């Protein structure tokens, strides 16, 4: 699958979400260049206003675009599953608040890498940092720890994201994730390692719909 990633690849993201009963959808488009661990995308809420803050959705919205150094290429599960793809499931625990459960399918459609997601959020507090919209339009992430899951011919991944609250405080989002191949073909099952990421959220000055522009860089390491 690595060969599929040598140049710039278009990406499409489609998400249907329901958080405490608030339903919404988001469409995103952009491109990824795995040689540089780089992605650029613009997301738009197609049903109106997003009911949760945009930064809470970044991680849900394509780790196959991570740059794996030559010496670690044999640990790159993500690209090895393509084009058939993989299912990525998560539970994201917002400290002292609700949780998101997501299921996505990541695969190629033609020359485009597609990430289709279903998200369900429950137990959020009506006036917590999420539904109350008290988060700043940014975040800080920890290392993304990856390990093999032989039993499922996949990987297990865990990490934390620290959301910044408007009052100067922090809201932790603990991520638990599993990825399993869609195809029956061989995949790379890796030794333990981690991804290091950074991103920048911005707005399209000329855009009136609720949206987010994202620039993100990710590199594998720890080997
Ligand atoms: Mg802070
Ligand atoms: Mg080994």
UniProtKB/Swiss-Prot annotation:
Give the domain of life: Eukaryota
Q: What is the effect of changing residue 62 to N?
A: In R10-3; matures to the red-emitting state with excitation and emission maxima at 555 and 585 nm, respectively
Effect noted on mutating residue 93 to S: In alphaGFP/cycle 3 GFP; improves folding at 37 degrees Celsius, reduces aggregation at high concentrations, and increases the diffusibility of the protein inside cells
Instruction: Describe PTMs of this protein.
Output: Contains a chromophore consisting of modified amino acid residues. Maturation of the chromophore requires nothing other than molecular oxygen.
Q: What is the effect of changing residue 62 to L?
A: In EYFP; leads to yellow fluorescence, folds faster and more efficiently at 37 degrees Celsius and has superior solubility and brightness
Q: What is the effect of changing residue 63 to H?
A: In P4; leads to no detectable fluorescence. In mut2.2; shifts fluorescence lifetime from 3.03 to 1.94 ns. In mut3.3; shifts fluorescence lifetime from 3.03 to 1.88 ns
Describe what happens upon changing residue 122 to V.
Answer: In EBFP2.0; shifts the excitation and emission spectra to shorter wavelengths and increases quantum yields compared to BFP
Describe the effect of residue 144 to I.
In Azurite; shifts the excitation and emission spectra to shorter wavelengths and increases quantum yields compared to BFP
Q: In which tissues is it expressed?
A: Photocytes.
Phenotype when changing residue 143 to K: Increases fluorescence at warmer temperatures such as 37 degrees Celsius. In Esmerald; leads to brighter fluorescence. In VisGreen; leads to brighter fluorescence
Among the record's GO biological process terms, what is one? generation of precursor metabolites and energy
Q: What is the effect of changing residue 139 to H?
A: In mut1.3; shifts fluorescence lifetime from 3.03 to 2.78 ns. In mut1.5; shifts fluorescence lifetime from 3.03 to 2.72 ns. In mut1.27; shifts fluorescence lifetime from 3.03 to 2.85 ns
Summarize the impact of residue 200 to K: Abolishes the tendency to dimerize and leads to monomeric fluorescent proteins
Q: Does the keyword Mitochondrion apply?
A: no
Result of changing residue 63 to M: In Citrinine; leads to excitation and emission peaks of 516 and 529 nm, respectively
Reported effect, residue 99 to T: In EBFP1.2; shifts the excitation and emission spectra to shorter wavelengths and increases quantum yields compared to BFP
Give the family this protein belongs to, as stated in its UniProt record.
Belongs to the GFP family.
Q: How does it assemble?
A: Monomer.
Query: What's the stated role of this polypeptide?
Result: Energy-transfer acceptor. Its role is to transduce the blue chemiluminescence of the protein aequorin into green fluorescent light by energy transfer. Fluoresces in vivo upon receiving energy from the Ca(2+)-activated photoprotein aequorin.
The name under which this protein is listed is: Green fluorescent protein
- Species name: Aequorea victoria
């Amino acid at each position: 699958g690595e060969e599929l990633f040598t140049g710039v690849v278009p990406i499409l993201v489609e998400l249907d979400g329901d958080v405490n009963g608030h339903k919404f959808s988001v469409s995103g488009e952009g491109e990824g260049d795995a040689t540089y661990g780089k992605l650029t995308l613009k997301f738009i809420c197609t049903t109106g206003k997003l009911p949760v803050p945009w930064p809470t959705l970044v991680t849900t919205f394509v780790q196959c675009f991570s740059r794996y150094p030559d010496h670690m290429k044999r640990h790159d599960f993500f690209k090895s599953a393509m084009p058939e793809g993989y299912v990525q499931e998560r539970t994201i625990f917002f400290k002292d608040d609700g949780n998101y459960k997501t299921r996505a399918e990541v695969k190629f459609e033609g020359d485009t890498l597609v990430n289709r997601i279903e998200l369900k959020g429950i137990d959020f507090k009506e006036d917590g940092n999420i539904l109350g919209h008290k988060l700043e339009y940014n975040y800080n992430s920890g290392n993304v720890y990856i390990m093999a899951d032989k039993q499922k011919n996949g990987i297990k991944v865990n990490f934390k994201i620290r959301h910044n609250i408007e009052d100067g405080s922090v809201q932790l989002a603990d991520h638990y994730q599993q990825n399993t191949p869609i195809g029956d073909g061989p995949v790379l099952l890796p030794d333990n390692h981690y991804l290091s990421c950074q991103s920048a959220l911005s707005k399209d000055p000329n855009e009136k719909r609720d949206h987010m522009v994202l620039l993100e860089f990710v590199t594998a390491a720890g080997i």
